[PDB]
C-alpha cells in the first residue's frame, strides 16, 4: 500500500488537470455542492441542468508575480461570465446557481521563496477609494476575466486596491477565516479550493450578484535566486459545477 | 469533559507538532502533543459565547431628537422634527454593528426598546406626562408628512402607546426575504450603473416615525428617543474576518482617506518584549 | 511606520548562530495579537483561560535548511535574552524540512484559572520568543532574507466569559445613508 | 410556560449544545490525523 | 435538639473541667460538667447565624454624586460629573467589610440596588422624570470619557434603564478567578519592587459609571447615587480575628498613626465590677 | 500587613519577604517595611484574637515544643510562590519570661519547618527578585 | 501504511524536538535506562526522582564546525551540572544516578559534504600532554557545558586533545566498536544516543565521577559550496532522564 | 418557582444544617476526649 497525497487529478467533463505537488484540497465548509432541492426552491419555473456543456475547466489568462505584486481579485461568476457557452446560460437567464472548483497555478524550482494566500471571501463587498459615502461602480467590480489587479491605480468606480485592507476594511491577517491555501514555492506549487454556493436565498441572480471573490495575495516577497527572471506566472483555472439557471429571457444587458 | 490528558515522554515517529499549513486545515495540536500534561477538566460549558449571547443582548442601535410644541405656522413639519422617522439599520452603531459583521448571515427576531426622556432647558414649569405613540412603517406604508397626518390611525400600521421615560416591548419575526440578513452582500440591486451598491431590498426593513400624540402645552419639549435592540433567535454562517476599519456608512464597507493605523507599533525592534 | 503585508513576515538573515528571531509577551489583548482573529474575539470578554497554539511556516527555499527553536517562558521570570536561559522552559526544536510548518501549543501554565485579557500584571500569560538553534543555511544563487507566517489560533480548551465592550471600534457621528 | 400564542414572543434558545469546529478547522477533502505527514 | 443534660454528683477521676491549652484545642466542656443540671432542650436552630444570613442582607456598600444639566463648554466632563464612575469594591463601608473581613475567602453570586434621588436646592419649579443609565464596565471595557461616549451602547456592557428614586436589581454570578474573593492577600500580583500590594486582579472587578441619558433641562439637578449590596450563595473559609482597628483604604489592612485605644479601661482595679 | 505611614501607604516586597530571617517586631520600622506593633498583630487586629487560627501555647511549666502541621491554604489549585505567601508563622510572648533568680535573662527559641506534599509547575529561567 | 522513518519526534516533560531527516536513534548496547532496583542498591537514604524538572531537552551552546576543526569532547553529567535545578541536586548530594537522551544537530544543504562522528565512550579518561606519569587535572576534564576543544592549545593540567588518539591512546577508526552514529549531511543531519546509567557500581559520585563522554569528531572534512560560509553551527541537546539522587547533603564545593 | 434560567436568580439556599464545630475546636492531630488527661 503506497500512494501519495501530493499527486492529485481531477477530470471534469473533457478537461483534465494534473498536478505533483498540491496540498489537500480545501472543500468550503466541508460542505460540497449540491443541486437546489425542491424543499427550497421559491421559483416555479423548471431549472436547466448543462453538466457536462459548463462544468469544465476553464483556464483564466496567467498573472505576473513580481516583487511588488500586491495581489490579485476575481469575482464568480463573473470570472467566467464572457467564457462559451456558460456566459451564455448566465446573461439569457434572469438567475443562476452553480458551485465552482478554484484551481490556482503557481510552480518554481526549489531555489525560489515565496508565499502567495489563495483565499475565497463569500461575499465580498469592496470599498471605494472616495470614502465618505462614495459607491463602487458596477463597472468595475464586475471585470470578468481579467480580475481586480491591486497594484494599479484607481479609477472613478472602481474599489480601493489596499490588500492591506482586503479592499473592504478589514486586515489581511484575518482573511485566514475564509477556506483558504498557501502556495509555498517550497511545499506546494498548486492550490484547489472547492467552492459551493454560498448565499442567503435558494436562488439569485447570477449577473449582479457574486456569490465568492477569489484572491491571490503574495504574503511573503517574491525571492528568485541570482540571475533568475523576477517573475512566476500564476495561472488560475475555475471549474463550475452543478450548474443551473431557470427563466431562459432575453439576452442579459450589461454596458459595453 | 476533559481538558487535558495525561502524557509523559513521547519518543515516536508520529510529530504531532509537525504540520503543513499550505493545505489550509489547523491541526488540533492539544498540549499533550508538545509536553508532559496532567490529567484536568473543564468546568466550563461556554455558555455565555453562544451567538445567541454574543449578539442576543439589548443595546443602544439608534437615537433622534424631537419636539412637541405649538406646530402653527410650521410647514416642514418633519423637517423641523415635529415627528422624525429613521430607516431601521442594525449598522449605525459599532460596537454592535461589528458583532454583527463578524458573520455574513444572520437570522434573527428583533426586539425594540424605544427610550424617550423629557427635558426642558428653557423656562418650563413642568415636565407634561407625555403618551409617545411608536409606528412601524413597512415598505409602501404612507411616509407621513405631519406630526397629524392620515397615517397615525395604524390600522395596518403597528402602533404602540405609551408615556415618556417608559418603553415600548414589541417582537419582531425575522422580516427578511432571504433565510438571513446579507451581512455582506458582494451585489447590486439591479444591472444598471448608476445603481447602489449593496444596500438594497435586503437592508431596507422599513423605518421607525417618532412623535407625540398630546397637543402642545406652553412650551418646547426637546426629547430625545434613543432606540435600543435586542436579537432573538440569532443564527449565523460564514465566519469573517473582524472589522478593522471604521465606517462612514449604514450597510457600506466604505472607509475615510489615511485611516489611522490600527496595529500597534513596538518599542523598539522585533526582539523586544 | 505604516500597517504592510511585512509586518507579518518574520525577517530572517543566514548564517546567525545563537540568535534570537522574534520576541512578544502573550497578551493576547494587546499588542501583535490585539488584531489577529483570536486578539479580536477575545476583547469582547473580560476572562480567558486555555491553551493557545502558535504555529511558523518556513517560506525560503526548499534546498535551504535551518533549525529554530520556539521557547515559551511562563510568567513570573522576564523574557529570555540568551538562548540558554529561553531554552530552560517550554521549548519545541523545530527541524525545518519536508514539513514546512510548526505546531507549538503554549500549555496553560497558570495558578488563578482564568486571566485578564487586558494587559494586568497579576495575570500575565508570559513571554514568547524563537532563536536560531544552529544557524540558517541558503543554497548557492539565494540571497537576501527569508520570512516566516505566525499563526495563532486557540485550543479546544480555551474559555471566554464576562463580555464587554471592545475598544477596537470608535463613532463620533450617527451614520447616514 | 409562554403567554403569548405566536413564535416572536418565545424566549431565546439558550445553547446550542452541538458544536462542530471542524468544519472550519478542518475543511479539507482528504482526512489529515493528527501527527501523520500532512503531504506525503 | 437536647440543650442540657441531666446530670447529679460527680466523684470520680475524670476531670472534664482540666485540660492545656497548650494543645490548641478547646474542650467541648458542658455546664453538666461542672455543676449539676437538668433536662433542657435547645428549642432554637440557629437559620440567622449562618454566613448566609450574617453576609447576605442588602445594605449601602457604596455612593455618589452627579448632575445632569446643559454640559456645553465643560471640556472635562466626567471629572464634572457628568458621569461618575466607581470601581467596585465590598471594602468602602465599613460595618459590612468588617464582616466580610472576619473571613479569608468568600465566594458569593450578588446583587446590587442602585438608589437614586431627585433634588434641586436651587431654583426649579420641578423633578424631572429622569431616566438613570446604569453600566457595568469589565476589564478593558472602554472606560468612557464623556456623558455621550461611544460607550454608551453598551452592546456587550450591561445596561440598566430605569427612572430616578427606583432602583435596578440585576444578578451577578461570582465573577472571581479563583474559588473565592481573597478576603486577605498575603502576595503581590508581580515581583517588582514598585507595585502594589495586596491590591490586583482579585481587587478588581470592573467599575459602575454612573448617568442620566436625558437631555438637559433648564436647572442643575444634583444627584445622588447611593449603591446598595446584598450577598447570595455566601460561602466562608478559614475564619479570621474580627477588625479592631478602622480602615483607611480599599483591601489595604493599613491603619492610621496614634490610632486611638479599643479596649475599655476599666474604672478602678482589676478587682473592680 | 499593615504600614506604618497609613493613609493609603502600601508595603514593600523588600520587607514582607525577609526570607529565614523573619520579621522582629522589637526592632525599628525601615521605609516599606509593615508595621511591627505586636499588640494589634501588624494588621489591625487584637493579640487576643489570633486564638481563631490553629496556634498552640509553648508553656515553659506544661510545653517546650509546639507541632502546627499547615497544609496549603489558598483560594485557588495553584498560586505562585515567589510573590504570594499563603500562611505566615508568628512567635507572639504572652507572658513575659521571669527566669529565676541568677539565671540568664534569654532563652534560644529554635523554628524547624519541614516542607511536605511539594509540587512545582512550569520549570522556567531563574525567578529574579531583587538583591 | 505509509510512514517515514526520518521524521522523528521525541518530548520529554516541557520539551519537545522535531527532525526529518534523523537517523534510526541508536540505543547504547540495546539497553534502555532504568531506575536503581531495590535487589542492587547499597546505600540506606531512599532517592529523590525530579522526574519532570530535570529530565527535559537543555541546548548546549552551539559549535562552529570550520574546515580545520579536530572536534569536540563533553562529560556527562558535568556538562549539565550548572544547568537550572539538574546542577543542584548534582551538587547538594554526594552521588547520584541518570540516563541521557543525547541529540547533535547540524544541518546544511544538500551541496555541502562532510560527515561527523557522534560516539558516546562510557569511562573515557584522558591523557596528558606531558606523558611519564602526568595526571589530568580535575579542572579541565570537568568543563561543564564548554566541553573540550580539540584544536585548542593545551594548558597545564587538561588532557592532550589528540583527536587521532581519542585523547587517550586508542584510534580514531576505532571508536565504532562504542554506541555511535554518523551525521552525513547527504543523509542525515541529527543523530540521537539513548544513554543508561553505565557504571560498575549500582550508584557513584556524579560531580568527580563522569560516566559517559560525548565526542562530536568530523571525520571527513567540511567542503562547503564555492562562495558559502566555510561554517555549520553543531548544537548539542542533551535530556536526563530516570533521575535519582541520594542524601541530600551541604552543598558540593569545586573549585571557582 | 423560578422565573429565570441561569443561576444567578435563583434564592439564596436558607440554612446550611451540616454544622462541624471540630474542625475549629479540636483541629488536634490526636484524639482527646473529655475527662481525659490532655497531656500524659
Known amino acids: 500500500c503506497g500512494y501519495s497525497d501530493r499527486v492529485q487529478q481531477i477530470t471534469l467533463g473533457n478537461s483534465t488537470i494534473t498536478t505533483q505537488e498540491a496540498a489537500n484540497a480545501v472543500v468550503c465548509y466541508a460542505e460540497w455542492p449540491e443541486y437546489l432541492p425542491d424543499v427550497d426552491a421559491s421559483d416555479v419555473n423548471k431549472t436547466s441542468k448543462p453538466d457536462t456543456s459548463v462544468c469544465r475547466f476553464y483556464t483564466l489568462d496567467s498573472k505576473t508575480w513580481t516583487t511588488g505584486s500586491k495581489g490579485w481579485c476575481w469575482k464568480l461568476p463573473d470570472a467566467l461570465k464572457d467564457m462559451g457557452v456558460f456566459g451564455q446560460n448566465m446573461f439569457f437567464h434572469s438567475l443562476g446557481r452553480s458551485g465552482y472548483t478554484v484551481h490556482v497555478q503557481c510552480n518554481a524550482t526549489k531555489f525560489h521563496s515565496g508565499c502567495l494566500l489563495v483565499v475565497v471571501i463569500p461575499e465580498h463587498q469592496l470599498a471605494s477609494h472616495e470614502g465618505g459615502n462614495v459607491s463602487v461602480k458596477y463597472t468595475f467590480t464586475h471585470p470578468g476575466e481579467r480580475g481586480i489587479d491591486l497594484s494599479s491605480a484607481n479609477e472613478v468606480g472602481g474599489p480601493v486596491k489596499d490588500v492591506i485592507y482586503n479592499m473592504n476594511g478589514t486586515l489581511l491577517g484575518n482573511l485566514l477565516i475564509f477556506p483558504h491555501q498557501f502556495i509555498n514555492l517550497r511545499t506546494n506549487n498548486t492550490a484547489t479550493i472547492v467552492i459551493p454556493y454560498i448565499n442567503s436565498v435558494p436562488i439569485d441572480s447570477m449577473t449582479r450578484h457574486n456569490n465568492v471573490s477569489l484572491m491571490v495575495i503574495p504574503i511573503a516577497p517574491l525571492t528568485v535566486p541570482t540571475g533568475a527572471t523576477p517573475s512566476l506566472p500564476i495561472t488560475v483555472t475555475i471549474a463550475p459545477m452543478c450548474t443551473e439557471f431557470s427563466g431562459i429571457r432575453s439576452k442579459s444587458i450589461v454596458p459595453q | ?273 | 511606520t505604516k500597517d504592510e503585508v511585512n509586518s507579518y513576515l518574520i525577517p530572517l538573515n543566514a548564517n546567525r548562530q545563537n540568535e534570537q528571531v522574534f520576541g512578544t509577551n502573550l497578551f493576547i489583548g494587546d499588542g501583535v495579537f490585539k488584531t489577529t482573529l483570536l486578539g479580536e474575539i477575545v476583547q469582547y470578554y473580560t476572562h480567558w483561560s486555555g491553551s493557545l497554539r502558535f504555529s511558523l511556516m518556513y517560506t525560503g527555499p526548499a534546498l535551504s535548511s535551518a533549525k529554530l527553536i520556539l521557547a515559551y517562558t511562563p510568567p513570573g521570570a522576564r523574557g529570555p535574552q540568551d538562548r540558554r536561559e529561553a531554552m530552560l522552559g517550554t521549548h519545541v526544536v523545530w527541524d525545518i524540512g519536508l514539513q514546512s510548518t510548526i505546531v507549538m501549543t503554549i500549555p496553560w501554565t497558570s495558578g488563578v484559572q482564568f486571566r485578564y485579557t487586558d494587559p494586568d500584571t497579576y495575570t500575565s500569560a508570559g513571554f514568547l520568543s524563537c532563536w536560531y538553534q544552529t544557524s540558517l543555511i541558503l543554497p548557492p544563487e539565494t540571497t537576501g532574507q527569508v520570512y516566516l507566517l505566525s499563526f495563532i489560533s486557540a485550543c479546544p480548551d480555551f474559555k471566554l466569559r464576562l463580555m464587554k465592550d471592545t475598544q477596537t471600534i470608535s463613532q463620533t457621528v450617527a451614520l447616514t445613508e | 410556560i409562554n403567554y403569548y400564542k405566536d413564535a416572536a414572543s418565545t424566549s431565546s434558545a439558550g445553547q446550542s449544545l452541538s458544536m462542530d469546529p471542524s468544519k472550519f478547522t478542518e475543511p479539507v477533502k482528504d482526512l489529515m490525523l493528527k501527527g501523520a505527514p500532512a503531504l506525503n
Chains 1, 7 share one sequence.
Not at chain 2, 486545515?25 to 454574543?54: K, Q, W
Not at chain 2, 430607516?87 to 461589528?98: C, G, M, P
Not at chain 2, 397615517?151 to 414589541?170: E, H, I, L
Open chain 2, 1 to 273: 469533559t476533559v481538558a487535558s490528558i495525561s502524557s509523559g515522554p513521547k519518543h515516536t515517529q508520529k510529530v504531532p507538532i509537525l504540520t503543513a499549513n499550505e493545505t489550509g486545515a489547523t491541526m488540533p495540536v492539544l498540549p499533550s502533543d508538545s509536553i508532559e500534561t496532567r490529567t484536568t477538566y473543564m468546568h466550563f460549558n461556554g455558555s455565555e459565547t453562544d451567538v445567541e449571547c454574543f449578539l442576543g443582548r439589548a443595546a443602544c442601535v439608534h437615537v433622534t431628537e424631537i419636539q412637541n410644541k405649538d406646530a402653527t405656522g410650521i410647514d416642514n413639519h418633519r423637517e423641523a422634527k415635529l415627528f422624525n422617522d429613521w430607516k431601521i439599520n442594525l449598522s449605525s452603531l459599532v460596537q454592535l454593528r461589528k458583532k454583527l459583521e463578524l458573520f455574513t448571515y444572520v437570522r434573527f427576531d428583533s426586539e425594540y426598546t424605544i427610550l424617550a426622556t423629557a427635558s426642558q432647558p428653557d423656562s418650563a414649569n413642568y415636565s407634561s406626562n407625555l403618551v409617545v405613540q411608536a409606528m412601524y412603517v413597512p415598505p409602501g406604508a404612507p411616509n407621513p408628512k405631519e406630526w397629524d397626518d392620515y397615517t397615525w390611525q395604524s390600522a395596518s400600521n403597528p402602533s404602540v402607546f405609551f408615556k415618556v421615560g417608559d418603553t415600548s416591548r414589541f417582537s419582531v419575526p425575522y422580516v427578511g426575504l432571504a433565510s438571513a440578513y446579507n451581512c455582506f452582500y458582494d451585489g447590486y440591486s439591479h444591472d444598471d450603473a448608476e445603481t447602489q451598491y449593496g444596500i438594497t431590498v435586503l437592508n431596507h426593513m422599513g423605518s421607525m416615525a417618532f412623535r407625540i400624540v398630546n397637543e402642545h402645552d406652553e412650551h418646547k419639549t426637546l426629547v430625545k428617543i434613543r432606540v435600543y435592540h435586542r436579537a432573538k433567535h440569532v443564527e449565523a454562517w460564514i465566519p469573517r474576518a473582524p472589522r478593522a476599519l471604521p465606517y462612514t456608512s449604514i450597510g457600506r464597507t466604505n472607509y475615510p482617506k489615511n485611516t489611522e493605523p490600527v496595529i500597534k507599533k513596538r518599542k523598539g525592534d522585533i526582539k523586544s518584549y
